[PDB]
Amino acid sequence: SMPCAIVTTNADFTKDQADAFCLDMGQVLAKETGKPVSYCMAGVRKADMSFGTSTDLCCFVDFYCIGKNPSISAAITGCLTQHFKVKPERVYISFNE
């Protein structure tokens, strides 16, 4: 529980788009962990980033839980893809349990 997903991305998003993403990401971490939505934190922050030999769209995710896993990965990645259009092969997730 106390689940939290902080995303670092080079996507071009407006603030309102980031807010929509975070709220949605919060409901996704809720379903995925069964803790209530009221305890889920999500953040997105911009960064200049490369992955391989290009600066094409990519994302790094820090996931935190106080405490069986590719369930969370597909869920977090699909959320990223739905909001920023990032290819899943350009999304790294760090589990900090």
Query: What residue has token string 């790294």?
Result: 92
Among 1, 11, 12, 26, binds its own copies (CB under 8 A): 26
**In whole angstroms, how close is the CB of 80 to Cl ion at the nearest point?**
9
Among 18, 22, 79, 80, binds Cl ion (CB under 5 A): 79
Residue 12: name the closest of 63, 77, 86, 82 by CA.
86
Neighbours of 54 (CB within 10 A): 9
CB hemisphere CA count around 95 (13 angstroms): 9
**In whole angstroms, how close is the CB of 44 to its own copies at the nearest point?**
5
Which parts of this chain interact with its own copies (CB under 8 A)?
2, 4, 6, 8, 10, 15, 18-19, 21-23, 25-26, 37-53, 55, 58, 60, 64, 92, 94, 96
